[PDB]
Amino acid sequence: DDDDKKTNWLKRIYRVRPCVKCKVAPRDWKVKNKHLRIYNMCKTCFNNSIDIGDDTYHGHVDWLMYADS
Numbered sequence: 001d002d003d004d005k006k007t008n009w010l011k012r013i014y015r016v017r018p019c020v021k022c023k024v025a026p027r028d029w030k031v032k033n034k035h036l037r038i039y040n041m042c043k044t045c046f047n048n049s050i051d052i053g054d055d056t057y058h059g060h061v062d063w064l065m066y067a068d069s
């Protein structure tokens with residue numbers, strides 16, 4: 001089932017690339033219509049980035065959660 005290919009890829013993508021800042025914790029994310037938004041940092045590092053005043057690692061990558069556009 002092609003939807004399963006997409007799901008399995010998104011599981012892998014989420015697992016293998018942790019937070020860009022601490023490089024250990026998984027990333028924060030949200031689901032937004034038919035898309036998965038994976039933010040660049042875990043919540044801990046994101047909250048801290050606000051406290052320290054660094055926007056460098058702010059950002060996200062959106063992913064279609066299904067196989068067919």
Ligand SMILES: Nc1ncnc2c1ncn2[C@@H]1O[C@H](COP(=O)(O)OP(=O)(O)OP(=O)(O)O)[C@@H](O)[C@H]1O
Pocket residue numbers: 027028039040041042043046057058059060
């Ligand atoms: N965990 C995270 N890692 C990296 N960037 C993040 C994370 N959470 C939020 N951001 C991004 O940091 C920026 C500042 O976030 P904030 O929530 O203060 O503003 P916002 O405009 O309400 O965010 P958004 O545009 O997502 O609604 C936004 O571009 C937001 O997408």
Ligand SMILES: [Zn+2]
Pocket residue numbers: 019020021022023024025041042043044045046
């Ligand atoms: Zn982190």
